[PDB]
Amino acid sequence: EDTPQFKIDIDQEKAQALGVSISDINTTLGAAWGGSYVNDFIDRGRVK
Amino acid sequence: TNTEEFGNILLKVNQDGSQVRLRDVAKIELGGESYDVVAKFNGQPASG
């Protein structure tokens, strides 16, 4: 069944006024909270 | 989703503060992906 869920609305006009690219908010908001997978690394003979 | 929403996109804010929306530089409407093909059944609109 449907459940409550937080909704964040980025005010497009305000963002341009303060000179913040919308493509940066979508990353900080999406990477800080949702987690991001940047790249791989080699450890103990395996890639992680 | 709506064409109204697309027409509300913000391209850039003028130095005077006036907004330059997408609808101010482009006519938005729902159209076909490709207009190359145009079918006709007994001289009547159709598709298949």
A13 interaction partners in chain B (CB closer than 8 Å): 10, 13, 19
CA B37 vs CA B40, B44, B45: distances in Å: 10, 15, 12
CA B38 vs CA A1, A4, B29, B33: distances in Å: 45, 47, 19, 12
Which amino acid, one-letter code, is at A29? L
Q: Do B24 and B12 meet the contact criterion of CB atoms below 8 Å apart?
A: no
This structure's resolution (Å) is 3.4
Q: Do A11 and A18 meet the contact criterion of CB atoms below 8 Å apart?
A: no
Q: Which residues contact A15 (CB under 8 A, 6 or more apart)?
A: A21, A22, A25
* Residue B22 CB neighbours (<10 A): 14
* B23 phi/psi in degrees, rounded to 5: -65, -15
Gap between the Cα atoms of A42 and B28, Å rounded: 50
Interface of A with B in 6-25 (CB under 8 A): 12-13, 16-17
- Beta-carbon-side half-sphere exposure of residue A8 (alpha carbons within 13 Å): 6
Alpha-carbon distance B10 to nearest alpha carbon in chain A (angstroms): 7
Which amino acid, one-letter code, is at B20? V
**Interface touch B10/A16, C-beta < 8 Å:** yes
